Structures are given as C-alpha cells and as structure tokens.
C-alpha cells in the first residue's frame, strides 16, 4: 500500500499533518478521490468535509472554502478556516 | 509578609489583568485576599490563636477559592465554626504557643469549607 | 464617629469619601495617560466623582449678592437620599453642570429640564 | 515652593510606574504578535506558489485582476492603530498617504479611502477626505475571522469596476527600533514572482473557473499579511 | 508698548511673546512624551517657536574674538520685517539651524543654502 | 584602581563588575521573554554571571553557630585566581549551586564532586 502526506493549513497556523492512504473531497467538478502518485492537480473547494482514510479508519476535517493542490508525493489543503471533526 | 510585598510591587499591573502570565495572576489574586483578611473593625479585638488560624488558612491556599468579596464573611463564619468545634486546636495553640497538627488543622479547614456557601 | 450616623448615614458618607479619594489619585494620571486608559474603567468613577463634587456645593441665603439666587436649606434625610441616588447611578445621564449650586436633588432634575435635557 | 515640588514628585512617580507596566505588557504583546505572523507563513507560501503557477506558468492575462486598465479612480488602503502613545507610528503613515495623494490627485472624485483603526479615520474626518470603508478594534488577534469581510469588500469594489488600482499603506516591522513606512500595489497583480516547480494539475473547472476563485483569496491573503 | 511700536512693531512684538508663552506652556509635557502626543495645531506652535527663539539670537562684533565670525548690526525695520515673515510661515521649510547666530532674515536663507538645503 | 591592584587584580575586578552589571539589565528582560530569548545568546553571560554571583558569597567563621560549617580565610591572590578561571569558563560544567557559600575555588570542585 502507498501513503501520501496530507497538510490542512490555515492563516491561523496548521490544522492536520499526517500520511493517510485515501482522501475524498468535494471539489468544483464534483467528488474527487486521491491516490499516491496522482498527477499534479489544482482545484477549488466549496464548504464540505475532507474524508481521510488511514488503515481503513476514516478522518473528517471541516473545510470552509479551500483550494486543493496535489503533487504525486504531497497533497496540500489551503483552507481559510478548517477544524478537525473532534475539534 | 512575602505575599503582601509582592502584591504591592505588582499593583500597577493589576489594571491589565487579562494579559499577564499565570504566575502574576496568582500573585495578584493572593494579594487581594491578603489585604481583605488584614481588614478589621474598630474596637473589635481578636485572640492571637484565631489570628494565627486565619492567617494559616490564607497562606496555605485554602482561601484562594473564595471571591475577594466573601473573605470577610468567611473569616467571621470560620471563627464561629472554631468556637463550636475547634476547641482542641484552640487549646493546643493556647497551651503550647505552637501550631497544631497539620493534618487535623487541614481537616478542620476543609470541613468548614464544606459548609460555607 | 460611627454609631449615630452608623447605619444609614455612615455607609453613604464613607462611600462618598472613598469615591473622592480615588478621584484625587486619578487626577495626575488622568491628564496624560489617564483620559484614554481610564476612559473605560475609571471613567465610571470620574463621571460620578465630578457629579458628587458638584452636588456637594450649595446656594446660601446670605450669599445672594454673590449668586443672584435665594438660598436653600436641605435636611439630612434629603441629603443622604440624594447622595445615595447619585451613587446608585440614577442620575448619570443628567449633565454635570445641572448639579451646581442647588439644594434638593429634585432641583438638579428641574435645572437639567430647563437646560433642555 | 516646597509643597508644590513634593506634589510634582509624587505625580511623576505615579506616572512612571504606569508607563513601566505599559512597556512590559507591550513587550509581551510584541512577542505574541511576531509568533502569530510566523504562524501564517506556510499558507502564504503555498497560495503564492500555486497562483504563480496557474496565472503566469500555465496561462496569461485572461482575468480582470491581472489586466491593467486605464485608471478612472484609485483606492488607498491604510492601516493605523486604534489608540495613541506610539511614537510617530500613525503620523508617519498618514503623512505619506496625504503627501502622495496630494501630489498625484487634483480633484476629490479621483480617489477613495479604505482605512483601519480610529486614528486614521479621525485624520481623514479632519479635512474632508472621501473615506469609503472603515473598521476599528480589530482585537489584534481579530481571530483573523473578523477581517475576512473588510478584505472581500475591497476586492469586490475593485471587481465591480469602482477601482482601477488599489494601494496599501502600513508600517513594516524591522525590529523594536526600526519600523519603515511601506506602500505596495495590491491590484492589478501586475508583478508576480516566478517559480518553476509544479505538480499534476487538475481541471474539474477550467482555467478561468479556477482563477475566479483563486485570485480574490490571494488578494485577501496579501491584505492579512500586511 | 505704547507709543512708538504701538502700531506696527507692537503687533509683531506681541505675536512673538504670545507664541513663546504657548511653547513655554507645552514644554512641561514635551519633556516626558516628546512631540508625538501634541495636537496638529499645537505642533505648529512648536515648529515656529523654535524658529523665533533661534532668530532672536545674534552674532556680536565683540564676540568675534571668541569666534572668527564677524558681527552684525540690524535695524529695527529689518528686525520687525524678519519676525513678521517667520510668523506668517514664509520660512517654515528651512532647518532650524539656519536661524542661529545671524543678522538679517536673508542671512538665514543664504546660510541654509550653504548648509545644502 | 590605581596602584596595587591596577595591574593584575584591577583587570579581574573590572571584568567581574561588568559581568554583574550586564546581568542586572538582563534581569528585567529575563523574566518574561528572556527565559526563552536569553537562553541561547545571553545564557553564556547569565550562566557565568550567576556562578560569579554565587562564588562572591562565603562561609564565615562566625556563621558556624547558624550552620555547621567551619569557615575559611581566602587570600587575595586566590580570589583573583578563582575569578579569572570562572571568567575563562573552566568551571561552566559545574552546577551553579556548587559555587555557593564556599572558600577557595577548589572547594567548589569538591562540593560538585560530592553532589554528583
């Protein structure tokens, strides 16, 4: 299996640094899925949550208007506000 | 004496409480209560043993839960509670001129707090 | 000398003196730093100290050649009532100049009315 | 007289103690503020990289914000504090703005003012300067969440056409002693820093739909950094 | 005051004294906080009072033996003229050092030009 | 200053005074910011200045009635020596507490060796 480092960043500071194995977002074109080694891709996001899978276990992070920036080795979320599900 | 001196040197910072570190906030909180307990009413003397007991309650941290406006009333009610059931402590102070056993003293103070409002 | 005044009058008299003592300390701070920094917390003290100090003045019967007015005679009940009202904030809205050279607090209310409040 | 000297001494001691506490608490607030600016850095870097890529690396002058147009009126964004007791901090910025707009505007309708903090607002109410947007307390933390709305409004005012160029005047921090006045052009984005690096870029929307959401956020982020 | 000066020269002399009196009132607060807390119209008073105060000083013939600078004799008309222009603001841009130890107001202009303004 | 000490001992004593003066200025900033911000740059000054401030104290003969310490008499050339070493950083590895209420410098080494 393959891991990709996911970063949720806000103007206030960080919000999530980890290397989960999946990640489902709700982008402008529709729902997008990301695997490690994905070709570079930038895409805006609307108000939704980003689902992060690690070992089958799922993680939710609320995102208030972000932008996805994908690299094969690293994925960056640039959200103007983002809180974890339990936060 | 230490608490009063620290409070006096910190007085000017009190106006800015929201911004201070927790150590300075603790010092200011202790100083306000110390000044409250040192107040007294004209022509009302206190026995030395009651003075020592209330000062012990202040300096040992038991009084830093109460609002600075309840400190006087707390002291009065504590004296009545002592009259009722701290006779062994009062007698020990009178006889030995020394502090009573710390564990029994702490139990008495906590017991009084269990009935303060 | 606490007894006679002691219940009603002594609490009002000491609260007036405490307010006027704080305003003296403020007056040197007030000028430079103080009118901005004081403007929230301490301006509540200053706003009442200005009015308490203007209300402590009075118009005398024998001072008509100096004031253009006849004098007034205020009984202690009315005095103690009026100063308790001002300390409770029942008159914070009236202009400070209405408090000057009057007798009863009703006269302050009437003077503000005449000023156009 | 001796009594007057004694009173002056007591007055002077009282004020010195208060200015000493106000110094120490400002020293604390400076340290927290600098850390807060460093906190913001990864996001400011990521958005700038992506914007450089998308607008300059991949495409061209296709969005209104990237396109120079003849100036029908320019807006001035000036950041000043909400209370006094800072040496020249506000007067420097207000002087620079006043002088510049006096030397490059002849008639009042040529310009508008968007200001932050009571001191600048009053400096403009004096005279009859045309101040269009304002805000005050920004409780320096403003959780940043409060300043989102003033930033969107200024960008939208440019977008609807009421501005053709937008500027920002504020003090820039060098150290405790040196704070340098600074003017930067906020719009159009006429000069974008290049970087070569890019990843696999996606197209759920088109280039234009990506820009329509990207550029306003980049401008709002420049305002928050200032 | 009364006769000689009383029309032309009296207006200039009283404007000079009024300006130096207001500067002298401000100097107390200028000592603690500097010029950063003044009002913008009270900042102009400082700006012109510095100029007036420096232009009141002169280079004497007998002081040449201390300093190689030769002295100057200035007529009353020129004295009144120069102080009138400074009070109007004709030279508000020159550095204050150009006003020190000169004669006529033209020497201030030439001295600032020599200084490089 | 002038004669006696002015060659050797005046150079050592001036360095001791300058070090303790620097530490007093630092004492205001140290409390909040300086606990972190001094900790690299100024810790070189503060770590040595606190060791100098502790080494200036001493065990007095007359103090033996307050605490069981015999007390010591330290010659002028030995105190000049010890302070020169501490200013050179020979003894920085030793805890500050080892320098407290002692005689010659050697007893600092012994106290540190005894406490670990």
XYZ file of C-alpha atoms in Angstrom:
780
model
C 0.000 0.000 0.000
C 1.021 3.614 -0.539
C 0.867 6.661 1.730
C 0.623 10.371 0.858
C 1.314 13.243 3.325
C -1.781 15.467 3.712
C -1.498 19.060 5.036
C -4.512 21.169 6.101
C -3.161 24.748 6.559
C -4.997 27.870 7.747
C -3.970 31.559 8.035
C -4.007 30.943 11.838
C -1.486 28.041 11.589
C -1.520 24.298 10.830
C -4.555 22.001 11.420
C -3.510 18.480 10.262
C -0.182 16.827 9.302
C -0.277 13.099 8.550
C 0.189 10.453 5.800
C -3.267 8.771 5.423
C -3.851 6.351 2.483
C -7.038 7.837 0.943
C -8.705 11.309 0.835
C -12.168 12.228 -0.528
C -13.016 15.870 -1.162
C -15.935 17.705 -2.767
C -14.367 19.892 -5.464
C -15.735 22.215 -8.143
C -16.068 19.461 -10.756
C -17.561 17.024 -8.237
C -16.304 14.436 -5.796
C -12.588 13.716 -6.223
C -10.527 10.787 -4.981
C -6.755 10.911 -4.495
C -4.182 8.102 -4.588
C -0.423 8.429 -4.078
C 1.364 9.147 -7.332
C -1.522 11.254 -8.647
C -0.586 13.694 -11.413
C -0.306 17.349 -10.304
C -3.739 18.890 -9.889
C -5.138 22.152 -8.512
C -8.847 22.611 -7.825
C -11.011 24.874 -5.648
C -13.309 23.505 -2.962
C -16.653 24.533 -1.529
C -17.931 24.178 2.033
C -17.659 20.482 2.905
C -15.550 17.978 4.827
C -12.450 16.140 3.622
C -12.505 12.415 4.406
C -9.096 10.900 5.199
C -8.561 7.133 5.301
C -5.722 5.554 7.291
C -5.787 1.787 7.726
C -9.464 1.732 6.829
C -10.150 4.175 9.653
C -11.734 7.410 8.421
C -10.954 11.006 9.404
C -13.133 14.086 8.867
C -11.947 17.696 8.645
C -14.402 20.520 8.004
C -13.176 22.927 5.316
C -14.549 26.441 4.773
C -13.649 27.317 1.192
C -10.224 25.890 0.432
C -8.117 25.060 -2.630
C -6.618 21.627 -3.356
C -3.013 21.478 -4.565
C -1.957 17.940 -5.487
C 1.538 16.587 -6.048
C 2.403 12.895 -6.512
C 4.331 12.957 -3.235
C 2.356 15.528 -1.223
C -1.165 16.990 -1.071
C -1.848 20.466 0.337
C -5.172 21.905 1.508
C -5.278 25.711 1.747
C -8.449 26.459 3.710
C -9.428 29.902 5.111
C -10.810 28.023 8.152
C -10.595 24.269 8.907
C -11.273 22.338 12.109
C -10.981 18.629 12.827
C -14.186 16.694 13.450
C -13.495 16.321 17.172
C -12.163 19.889 17.467
C 4.656 39.345 54.506
C 6.019 37.948 51.238
C 2.589 37.905 49.601
C 1.810 41.456 50.692
C 5.128 42.794 49.369
C 4.749 41.054 46.007
C 1.219 42.405 45.676
C 2.358 45.946 46.434
C 5.058 45.793 43.772
C 2.570 44.303 41.293
C -0.279 46.774 41.930
C 0.323 48.754 38.724
C -0.021 45.602 36.562
C -3.463 44.810 38.050
C -5.190 47.224 35.605
C -4.011 44.926 32.753
C -5.029 41.530 34.268
C -6.212 39.941 31.029
C -2.663 39.996 29.642
C -0.496 38.740 32.496
C 1.152 35.348 32.829
C -0.403 32.899 35.280
C 2.266 33.485 37.930
C 1.498 37.204 38.109
C -2.234 36.500 38.085
C -1.745 34.131 41.024
C 0.250 36.768 42.888
C -2.427 39.417 42.352
C -5.181 37.031 43.433
C -3.286 36.230 46.631
C -2.556 39.893 47.365
C -6.178 40.980 47.103
C -7.241 38.294 49.580
C -4.396 39.103 51.966
C -5.434 42.748 52.046
C -9.014 41.662 52.666
C -8.105 39.456 55.623
C -5.966 42.172 57.199
C -9.006 44.466 57.491
C -10.595 44.916 60.904
C -13.384 46.795 62.657
C -12.661 49.436 65.269
C -12.919 48.266 68.916
C -13.114 44.536 67.920
C -10.002 42.660 69.091
C -9.221 39.081 68.062
C -7.482 36.404 70.165
C -3.996 35.506 68.980
C -4.937 31.886 68.297
C -7.776 32.926 65.983
C -5.433 35.367 64.247
C -2.895 32.595 63.675
C -5.508 30.155 62.396
C -6.989 32.558 59.852
C -3.541 33.615 58.660
C -2.657 29.932 58.246
C -5.826 29.383 56.226
C -4.833 32.274 53.969
C -1.180 31.376 53.443
C -1.825 27.661 52.920
C -4.108 28.178 49.913
C -7.460 27.304 51.484
C -8.804 30.802 50.979
C -7.929 31.236 47.291
C -11.166 29.618 46.144
C -13.397 32.291 47.714
C -14.219 35.552 45.907
C -12.376 38.524 47.388
C -15.774 39.857 48.490
C -16.567 36.771 50.583
C -13.290 36.854 52.538
C -14.506 38.966 55.483
C -17.705 36.940 55.892
C -15.724 33.717 55.524
C -13.445 34.816 58.359
C -16.373 35.606 60.650
C -18.158 32.314 59.991
C -14.864 30.453 60.414
C -14.453 31.977 63.863
C -17.933 30.793 64.829
C -17.161 27.306 63.486
C -13.965 27.253 65.549
C -15.882 28.281 68.666
C -18.244 25.374 68.069
C -15.868 22.528 67.266
C -12.192 23.578 67.004
C -11.685 23.649 70.757
C -8.861 21.109 70.650
C -6.969 23.265 68.141
C -7.601 26.450 70.118
C -6.500 24.799 73.361
C -3.363 23.366 71.775
C -2.339 26.786 70.489
C -3.057 28.417 73.847
C -1.051 25.819 75.749
C 1.977 25.174 73.524
C 2.166 28.570 71.773
C 2.716 26.412 68.667
C 0.848 25.374 65.550
C -1.431 22.329 65.951
C -1.077 19.120 63.955
C -1.218 19.990 60.271
C -3.448 17.080 59.229
C -6.100 17.824 61.868
C -5.913 21.528 61.019
C -6.411 20.795 57.324
C -9.371 18.550 58.090
C -10.956 21.304 60.172
C -10.491 23.928 57.451
C -11.834 21.665 54.693
C -14.774 20.699 56.912
C -15.657 24.367 57.372
C -15.412 24.952 53.633
C -17.826 22.052 53.148
C -20.433 24.199 54.931
C -19.528 27.634 53.590
C -21.722 28.935 50.774
C -17.968 58.589 64.899
C -19.721 55.599 63.732
C -22.680 54.931 65.949
C -25.205 57.658 65.297
C -24.872 58.036 61.611
C -23.730 54.401 61.579
C -26.484 52.565 59.951
C -27.794 54.757 57.185
C -25.698 57.841 57.018
C -22.269 56.353 57.798
C -22.302 53.999 54.813
C -23.228 56.890 52.442
C -20.655 59.279 53.983
C -17.770 56.753 53.739
C -18.727 55.762 50.136
C -18.682 59.482 49.121
C -15.210 59.927 50.712
C -13.853 56.728 49.057
C -15.045 57.969 45.621
C -13.445 61.420 46.137
C -10.152 59.874 47.406
C -9.877 57.728 44.226
C -10.554 60.779 42.021
C -7.571 62.689 43.612
C -5.168 59.824 42.720
C -6.665 59.691 39.249
C -6.271 63.483 38.637
C -2.500 63.331 37.911
C -2.830 60.031 35.930
C -5.966 61.482 34.211
C -4.147 64.191 32.437
C -1.682 62.308 30.311
C -2.309 58.606 30.143
C -5.453 58.601 32.024
C -8.136 60.135 29.882
C -7.786 57.408 27.260
C -6.828 54.477 29.557
C -9.129 55.381 32.449
C -11.915 56.127 29.904
C -13.388 52.656 30.324
C -12.889 51.520 33.928
C -12.042 54.565 35.946
C -14.234 56.997 33.936
C -17.171 55.335 35.737
C -15.508 56.611 38.978
C -14.611 60.048 37.455
C -18.129 60.588 35.990
C -19.677 60.183 39.482
C -16.853 61.994 41.342
C -17.399 65.120 39.107
C -21.178 64.992 39.927
C -20.755 64.208 43.677
C -18.278 67.096 43.886
C -20.652 69.458 42.034
C -23.621 68.337 44.152
C -21.697 68.981 47.449
C -21.920 72.705 46.601
C -24.945 74.757 47.616
C -26.550 78.192 47.365
C -26.615 80.163 50.616
C -29.227 82.609 51.884
C -26.594 85.159 52.874
C -24.740 84.708 49.552
C -27.411 86.245 47.317
C -25.249 89.261 46.489
C -22.730 86.741 45.136
C -25.006 84.191 43.451
C -28.015 86.108 42.152
C -30.196 83.469 43.830
C -32.009 82.947 47.112
C -30.650 80.250 49.367
C -31.790 76.751 50.212
C -31.992 74.634 53.370
C -31.503 70.882 52.943
C -32.478 68.410 55.694
C -30.125 65.483 56.376
C -32.644 62.892 55.170
C -32.825 64.553 51.758
C -29.036 64.953 51.623
C -28.418 61.255 52.418
C -31.169 60.230 49.932
C -29.745 62.361 47.083
C -26.139 61.148 47.521
C -27.377 57.516 47.679
C -29.210 58.091 44.332
C -26.136 59.580 42.669
C -24.008 56.631 43.896
C -26.676 54.173 42.569
C -26.438 55.826 39.163
C -29.999 57.124 38.934
C -28.647 60.472 37.555
C -25.569 59.505 35.437
C -27.445 60.852 32.325
C -28.028 64.451 33.546
C -25.328 66.977 32.592
C -22.746 67.653 35.278
C -23.450 71.395 35.274
C -27.020 70.897 36.496
C -25.657 69.712 39.865
C -24.033 73.067 40.663
C -25.328 75.409 43.396
C -28.656 73.731 44.179
C -30.387 72.241 47.195
C -32.506 69.124 46.821
C -31.816 66.645 44.013
C -35.238 67.438 42.554
C -33.723 70.862 41.908
C -30.968 69.208 39.847
C -33.631 67.413 37.819
C -35.508 70.681 37.279
C -32.354 72.544 36.254
C -31.458 69.885 33.691
C -35.009 70.104 32.354
C -34.578 73.863 31.962
C -31.221 73.332 30.221
C -33.135 71.172 27.752
C -32.350 67.576 28.684
C 7.579 76.181 46.818
C 8.476 73.015 48.731
C 4.929 71.620 48.841
C 4.495 72.006 45.080
C 7.764 70.172 44.465
C 6.655 67.322 46.716
C 3.367 67.038 44.808
C 5.149 67.082 41.449
C 7.457 64.311 42.653
C 4.554 62.091 43.689
C 2.696 62.750 40.413
C 5.853 61.940 38.388
C 6.462 58.688 40.311
C 2.848 57.526 39.783
C 3.028 58.152 36.019
C 6.461 56.441 35.721
C 5.136 53.279 37.346
C 2.176 53.191 34.927
C 4.394 53.772 31.829
C 6.730 50.967 33.096
C 3.842 48.447 33.305
C 2.591 49.582 29.850
C 6.146 48.970 28.489
C 6.364 45.402 29.886
C 2.875 44.401 28.653
C 3.655 45.822 25.144
C 6.906 43.771 25.211
C 4.771 40.645 25.857
C 2.254 41.586 23.109
C 5.102 42.195 20.585
C 6.455 38.676 21.243
C 2.991 37.079 20.770
C 2.365 39.201 17.621
C 5.661 38.140 15.969
C 4.926 34.490 16.675
C 1.431 34.997 15.187
C 2.982 36.381 11.965
C 5.353 33.424 11.723
C 2.377 31.086 12.222
C 0.757 32.269 8.939
C 3.797 31.538 6.733
C 3.092 28.100 5.161
C -0.325 29.172 3.837
C 1.033 32.445 2.459
C 3.742 30.476 0.679
C 1.504 27.746 -0.742
C -1.066 30.110 -2.205
C 1.616 32.274 -3.794
C 3.298 29.258 -5.387
C 0.031 27.943 -6.798
C -1.003 31.388 -8.062
C 2.313 31.918 -9.819
C 1.948 28.527 -11.485
C -1.658 28.934 -12.600
C -1.552 32.529 -13.822
C 1.994 33.018 -15.146
C 3.314 29.467 -15.565
C 0.333 27.959 -17.375
C -1.615 30.862 -18.887
C -1.833 34.591 -19.448
C -3.734 37.822 -18.955
C -7.257 36.369 -19.057
C -8.663 37.561 -15.720
C -9.717 41.150 -14.948
C -7.481 41.295 -11.857
C -4.380 40.506 -13.935
C -5.213 43.060 -16.648
C -4.177 46.701 -16.416
C -6.938 49.123 -17.339
C -6.832 52.925 -17.560
C -7.302 54.447 -14.129
C -10.644 56.156 -13.532
C -10.048 56.281 -9.766
C -7.721 54.586 -7.296
C -8.391 53.425 -3.746
C -5.987 53.778 -0.832
C -5.838 51.148 1.920
C -4.131 52.424 5.072
C -3.643 50.522 8.346
C -3.334 52.568 11.554
C -3.865 51.833 15.232
C -6.940 52.426 17.430
C -5.208 54.348 20.327
C -2.256 56.703 20.912
C 1.008 56.503 22.919
C 3.093 55.216 19.965
C 5.784 57.480 18.622
C 5.055 58.545 15.036
C 3.564 55.129 14.212
C 0.331 56.654 12.898
C 1.578 60.087 11.845
C 4.211 58.599 9.528
C 1.703 56.546 7.543
C -0.877 59.332 7.459
C 1.771 61.802 6.259
C 2.917 59.506 3.462
C -0.635 58.886 2.254
C -1.598 62.565 2.396
C 1.514 63.721 0.553
C 1.303 61.062 -2.160
C -2.368 61.590 -2.977
C -1.895 65.359 -2.871
C 0.998 65.107 -5.343
C -0.863 62.745 -7.681
C -4.540 63.771 -7.476
C -6.130 67.101 -8.381
C -9.834 66.639 -7.649
C -11.604 64.688 -4.879
C -13.504 62.214 -7.095
C -10.258 60.669 -8.368
C -9.739 58.545 -5.236
C -11.313 56.733 -2.293
C -10.085 55.785 1.183
C -10.365 52.431 2.937
C -8.893 52.746 6.423
C -8.317 50.541 9.516
C -8.208 51.982 13.107
C -9.690 55.120 14.835
C -6.629 57.362 14.444
C -6.548 57.313 10.651
C -10.322 57.598 10.479
C -10.157 60.804 12.524
C -7.208 62.093 10.492
C -9.444 61.816 7.437
C -12.608 63.204 9.046
C -10.430 66.213 9.680
C -10.185 67.827 6.312
C -12.910 66.447 4.040
C -11.210 63.373 2.642
C -13.572 60.889 0.871
C -13.346 57.795 3.085
C -15.457 54.956 1.702
C -14.880 51.986 4.030
C -13.718 51.760 7.622
C -13.204 49.409 10.633
C -11.633 49.951 14.194
C -10.883 47.462 17.156
C -9.598 44.552 15.049
C -8.729 42.935 18.510
C -5.244 42.335 17.006
C -5.872 38.722 17.126
C -9.200 39.750 15.222
C -9.483 35.984 15.425
C -8.428 36.879 11.728
C -12.040 35.706 11.059
C -13.373 39.310 11.578
C -11.098 40.859 8.847
C -12.348 38.425 6.142
C -15.347 40.688 5.443
C -13.423 44.003 5.048
C -10.969 42.199 2.672
C -13.739 40.637 0.461
C -15.467 44.015 0.235
C -12.369 45.819 -1.029
C -11.708 43.125 -3.625
C -15.354 43.234 -4.706
C -15.214 47.006 -5.044
C -12.291 46.600 -7.416
C -14.149 43.832 -9.259
C -17.365 45.762 -9.903
C -15.256 48.468 -11.580
C -15.217 51.223 -8.945
C -11.404 50.950 -8.809
C -8.663 50.501 -11.377
C -5.703 50.426 -8.970
C -5.586 49.682 -5.249
C -2.777 50.506 -2.827
C -1.815 49.646 0.743
C -0.037 51.918 3.241
C 1.179 50.472 6.521
C 4.178 50.217 8.815
C 6.526 47.296 8.204
C 8.355 45.735 11.128
C 12.165 45.600 11.023
C 12.988 45.458 14.744
C 11.997 47.077 18.020
C 13.547 50.375 16.935
C 13.087 50.452 13.139
C 9.599 50.487 11.636
C 9.642 51.535 7.988
C 6.628 53.001 6.203
C 5.674 50.950 3.154
C 3.463 51.272 0.078
C 2.619 48.244 -2.063
C 0.355 47.939 -5.086
C -2.402 45.455 -4.286
C -4.176 45.323 -7.664
C -3.893 44.567 -10.504
C -1.412 41.745 -9.786
C 0.878 43.386 -12.310
C 4.051 41.696 -10.980
C 4.071 38.032 -9.933
C 7.131 36.196 -8.647
C 8.092 33.195 -10.768
C 8.871 29.669 -9.647
C 9.372 26.738 -11.998
C 8.003 23.837 -9.944
C 4.522 22.370 -10.433
C 2.630 19.118 -9.802
C -0.067 17.255 -11.740
C -2.667 19.995 -12.165
C -6.357 19.178 -12.482
C -9.253 20.721 -14.363
C -12.606 19.976 -12.696
C -13.279 23.594 -13.620
C -11.456 25.336 -16.413
C -8.529 27.715 -16.054
C -10.988 30.611 -15.844
C -13.140 28.967 -13.182
C -10.019 28.193 -11.158
C -8.882 31.823 -11.340
C -12.308 33.221 -10.466
C -11.980 31.613 -7.021
C -8.203 31.791 -6.624
C -7.384 35.449 -7.265
C -9.750 37.061 -4.703
C -8.379 34.755 -1.953
C -4.802 35.685 -2.915
C -5.637 39.375 -2.563
C -7.400 38.815 0.818
C -4.292 36.917 1.984
C -1.960 39.802 0.978
C -4.149 42.171 2.981
C -3.973 39.886 6.048
C -0.171 39.645 5.794
C 0.090 43.427 5.759
C 4.391 99.057 24.128
C 2.577 102.204 23.938
C 3.733 104.795 21.577
C 6.401 104.078 19.147
C 5.969 100.483 18.461
C 2.269 100.783 19.193
C 1.025 100.482 15.648
C 3.404 98.497 13.510
C 6.034 96.965 15.684
C 3.639 96.315 18.608
C 1.660 93.763 16.587
C 4.887 91.840 15.762
C 6.293 92.087 19.326
C 3.038 90.815 20.930
C 2.723 87.931 18.393
C 6.304 86.853 19.279
C 5.599 86.961 23.050
C 2.266 85.078 22.672
C 3.986 82.288 20.670
C 6.866 81.922 23.180
C 4.357 81.861 26.082
C 2.397 78.950 24.467
C 5.599 76.998 23.707
C 6.615 77.543 27.385
C 3.240 76.093 28.444
C 3.797 72.966 26.324
C 7.413 72.364 27.358
C 6.359 70.513 30.523
C 4.548 67.701 28.683
C 7.127 67.833 25.847
C 9.714 66.753 28.426
C 8.046 63.400 29.305
C 6.444 62.324 25.999
C 8.034 64.439 23.247
C 6.112 65.908 20.342
C 4.261 62.709 19.418
C 1.169 63.398 21.595
C 0.522 67.057 20.634
C -2.395 68.234 18.537
C -1.558 69.051 14.938
C -2.211 72.758 15.534
C -0.203 72.666 18.754
C 2.637 71.087 16.773
C 2.811 74.162 14.539
C 3.358 76.300 17.650
C 6.466 74.262 18.487
C 7.583 74.418 14.852
C 7.518 78.210 14.709
C 8.556 78.914 18.304
C 11.808 77.068 17.681
C 12.466 79.334 14.672
C 11.561 82.543 16.581
C 13.682 81.523 19.576
C 16.722 80.867 17.388
C 16.240 84.012 15.285
C 16.268 86.155 18.495
C 19.970 85.281 18.901
C 22.644 87.277 17.116
C 26.348 87.483 16.311
C 28.039 90.340 18.168
C 31.024 92.346 16.992
C 32.770 91.794 20.333
C 32.240 88.032 20.106
C 34.452 87.848 17.013
C 37.432 87.441 19.344
C 35.850 84.248 20.640
C 34.710 83.101 17.179
C 36.109 84.093 13.800
C 32.612 85.179 12.740
C 32.245 88.966 12.348
C 29.263 90.603 13.997
C 26.203 92.319 12.576
C 24.128 95.457 13.156
C 20.428 95.057 12.356
C 17.918 97.934 12.034
C 14.515 97.894 13.753
C 12.650 97.803 10.418
C 14.562 94.722 9.301
C 14.039 93.108 12.733
C 10.249 93.715 12.543
C 10.230 92.551 8.853
C 12.031 89.231 9.537
C 9.922 88.287 12.573
C 6.730 89.131 10.593
C 7.698 86.716 7.760
C 8.640 83.962 10.214
C 5.270 84.431 11.988
C 3.452 84.173 8.611
C 5.249 80.964 7.656
C 7.436 82.147 4.781
C 10.407 80.074 6.006
C 8.721 77.081 7.644
C 10.735 74.695 5.463
C 14.259 75.737 6.431
C 16.155 73.667 9.009
C 16.098 75.389 12.365
C 19.906 75.609 12.400
C 19.891 78.226 9.639
C 18.431 80.743 12.108
C 21.245 80.561 14.672
C 23.669 83.480 15.040
C 22.717 85.569 12.011
C 21.671 89.134 11.338
C 19.009 89.885 8.743
C 16.484 87.279 7.641
C 18.272 86.991 4.282
C 21.321 85.559 6.039
C 19.125 82.669 7.206
C 18.296 81.850 3.580
C 21.915 82.090 2.494
C 23.056 80.004 5.478
C 20.572 77.225 4.734
C 21.644 77.267 1.084
C 25.249 76.944 2.249
C 24.205 74.058 4.522
C 22.820 72.421 1.393
C 19.050 72.834 1.591
C 42.129 51.014 40.937
C 45.362 52.776 40.747
C 48.339 51.238 42.306
C 48.322 47.855 43.694
C 45.565 46.037 42.099
C 45.808 48.240 38.988
C 47.913 45.752 37.089
C 46.592 42.245 37.759
C 43.720 42.418 40.133
C 42.098 45.521 38.577
C 41.691 43.697 35.239
C 39.935 40.768 37.034
C 37.784 43.051 39.237
C 36.646 45.237 36.271
C 35.545 42.074 34.355
C 33.584 40.852 37.445
C 31.796 44.243 37.770
C 30.967 44.447 34.011
C 29.567 40.869 34.075
C 27.319 41.535 37.118
C 26.128 44.897 35.657
C 25.131 43.147 32.352
C 23.165 40.533 34.353
C 21.166 43.299 36.204
C 19.963 44.803 32.873
C 19.144 41.279 31.672
C 17.151 40.626 34.920
C 14.175 42.711 33.692
C 14.024 41.153 30.186
C 14.930 37.647 31.502
C 11.766 37.309 33.469
C 9.225 37.028 30.629
C 10.827 36.996 27.185
C 14.370 36.415 28.197
C 13.706 32.995 29.791
C 13.480 31.782 26.157
C 15.355 34.592 24.311
C 18.361 34.829 26.607
C 18.528 31.018 26.696
C 20.961 30.770 23.778
C 22.864 34.045 23.495
C 22.634 35.620 26.892
C 22.743 32.233 28.719
C 26.519 32.410 28.042
C 26.513 35.667 30.104
C 23.835 34.623 32.688
C 25.238 31.120 33.347
C 28.672 32.647 34.128
C 27.215 35.716 35.943
C 25.138 33.527 38.359
C 28.257 31.401 39.067
C 30.206 34.667 39.746
C 27.356 35.946 41.958
C 27.359 32.663 43.929
C 31.153 32.490 44.208
C 31.199 36.010 45.787
C 29.405 34.532 48.822
C 31.385 32.764 51.513
C 31.265 30.710 54.695
C 32.147 32.898 57.679
C 33.872 31.606 60.796
C 31.213 33.356 62.924
C 28.458 31.615 60.867
C 29.265 28.202 62.338
C 26.727 28.863 65.134
C 23.943 29.141 62.484
C 25.013 26.158 60.376
C 27.707 23.547 60.847
C 30.400 24.977 58.569
C 33.938 25.605 59.867
C 34.502 28.748 57.786
C 37.501 29.855 55.766
C 40.060 32.613 55.152
C 40.829 33.229 51.480
C 43.889 35.205 50.291
C 43.630 37.980 47.737
C 45.727 36.171 45.074
C 43.475 33.067 45.410
C 40.280 35.092 44.900
C 41.944 36.872 41.922
C 42.844 33.367 40.583
C 39.363 31.762 41.007
C 37.507 34.682 39.417
C 39.988 34.668 36.477
C 39.183 30.947 35.912
C 35.423 31.426 36.106
C 35.730 34.345 33.635
C 37.730 31.960 31.355
C 34.952 29.282 31.547
C 36.998 26.478 33.106
C 34.200 25.697 35.583
C 30.993 26.196 33.476
C 30.180 22.418 33.551
C 29.676 22.535 37.361
C 26.200 23.307 38.739
C 25.598 26.827 39.986
C 24.773 25.525 43.472
C 28.285 24.072 43.851
C 29.671 27.633 43.908
C 27.610 28.760 46.887
C 28.901 29.642 50.361
C 32.407 28.216 49.985
C 36.031 29.284 50.330
C 38.706 28.791 47.678
C 37.788 27.577 44.193
C 38.937 24.007 44.916
C 36.171 23.530 47.457
C 33.731 24.222 44.617
C 35.201 21.253 42.755
C 34.868 19.158 45.917
C 31.282 20.258 46.557
C 30.295 19.449 42.973
C 32.043 16.073 43.118
C 30.168 15.337 46.354
C 26.757 16.307 44.977
C 27.477 14.420 41.744
